[PDB]
Write a protein that binds this ligand. Structure first.
Ligand SMILES: NC(=O)C1=CN([C@@H]2O[C@H](COP(=O)(O)OP(=O)(O)OC[C@H]3O[C@@H](n4cnc5c(N)ncnc54)[C@H](OP(=O)(O)O)[C@@H]3O)[C@@H](O)[C@H]2O)C=CC1
Length: 325
């Protein structure tokens, strides 16, 4: 039940997802071209069979290059690889959903994506511009209609362009809007949100479990802590005293402890690293386990403080972080 060779958990639609994957976000201005492609190939050699990306990260093509090359080499087959892509805020308009996915398919040079999700529940003004703002720097929004957007997504699955459908950054109310939708064809199988020892998501996780929705934890190591956008007010997760002390009990790092914590609770983790050594390190989480006591010690570290607040959009009608969960 969870080994390096076998670690996929069931999704409610019949498919499965590798409990750990490689995250690929990285600040453009300072990330050398090819770093992503090289990192993805290293991840595959190491044992990863899940990659998390997004067209807006500006390196989706590099993910395709690495996946296609590893298939060409015969290291893996397409069906062995699980790739997750995301529909951005500026693409919520129903008629723009399929064209957006197809563009990503051209970028990857693949026939389908294993998981496609609505990146944020907030709709932004349609266009090529990813971060639309008017002359006065004010954010250009659009009226959201999550049920209409979801229907367009379902049609994408019916056409064979994506295996499983999901969401990201959705709160309880937003999930329920979809779940109780009349004529619902494909239930969301996953909700990707921030999750780690400082923000354990106890109520949302419990809610998702009740509806057989699997949570994928983004920023599982606590983010890169880039001041430009990260809530630096909260202390660096990997420097946590207890996590480090627990690490010495099994000769593992804090990073390895936090990753084991979530996977052991049935939570998918997608740590990002473009460093040869760290990529390998993050994968060594199947040769040990945390005791029931230790899981409770780690859970008690919950501060209910997000490292990713997205405050610039707190004025959007569908901003997901006002509600308790
Ligand atoms: N849908 C959404 O709204 C969002 C989705 N995401 C997704 O979730 C993924 C989660 O990763 P992310 O948010 O970037 O942050 P993470 O918490 O995964 O990692 C942040 C930093 O950790 C470092 N790191 C990795 N391994 C180790 C280690 N063993 N020891 C010390 N430092 C380490 C990396 O540096 P280095 O590369 O030098 O190793 C990196 O800069 C993303 O890459 C993205 O795919 C992220 C935010 C939002």
């Amino acid at each position: 039940d969870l080994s390096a060779a076998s670690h996929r958990i069931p999704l409610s639609d019949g498919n499965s997802i590798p409990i750990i994957g490689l995250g690929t976000y990285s600040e453009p201005k300072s990330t050398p071209k090819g770093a992503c492609a090289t990192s993805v190939k290293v991840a595959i050699d190491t044992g990863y069979r899940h990659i998390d990306g997004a067209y807006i990260y500006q390196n989706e093509h590099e993910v395709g290059e690495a996946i296609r090359e590893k298939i060409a080499e015969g290291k893996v087959r397409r069906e062995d690889i699980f790739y997750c892509g995301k529909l951005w805020a500026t693409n919520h308009v129903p008629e723009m959903v399929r064209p957006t996915l197809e563009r990503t398919l051209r970028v990857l040079q693949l026939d389908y994506v294993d998981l496609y999700i609505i990146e944020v529940p907030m709709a932004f003004k349609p266009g090529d511009e990813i971060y639309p703002r008017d002359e006065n720097g004010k954010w250009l929004y659009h009226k959201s209609n999550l049920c209409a957007t979801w229907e367009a997504m379902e049609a994408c699955k019916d056409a064979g362009l994506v295996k499983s459908l999901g969401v990201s950054n959705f709160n309880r109310r937003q999930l329920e809007l979809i779940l109780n939708k009349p004529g619902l064809k494909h239930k969301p199988v996953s909700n990707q949100v921030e999750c780690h020892p400082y923000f354990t998501q106890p109520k949302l996780l419990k809610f998702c479990q009740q509806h057989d929705i699997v949570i994928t934890a983004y920023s599982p190591l606590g983010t890169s802590r880039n001041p430009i956008w990260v809530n630096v007010s909260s202390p660096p997760l990997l420097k946590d005293a207890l996590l480090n002390s627990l690490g010495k009990r099994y000769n593992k790092t804090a990073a390895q402890i936090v990753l084991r914590f979530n996977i052991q609770r049935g939570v998918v983790v997608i740590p990002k690293s473009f460093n040869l050594e760290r990529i390998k390190e993050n994968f060594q989480i199947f040769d040990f386990s945390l005791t029931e006591e230790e899981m409770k010690d780690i859970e008690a570290l919950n501060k209910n403080v997000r490292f990713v607040e997205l405050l610039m959009w707190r004025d959007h009608p569908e901003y997901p972080f006002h509600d308790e969960y």
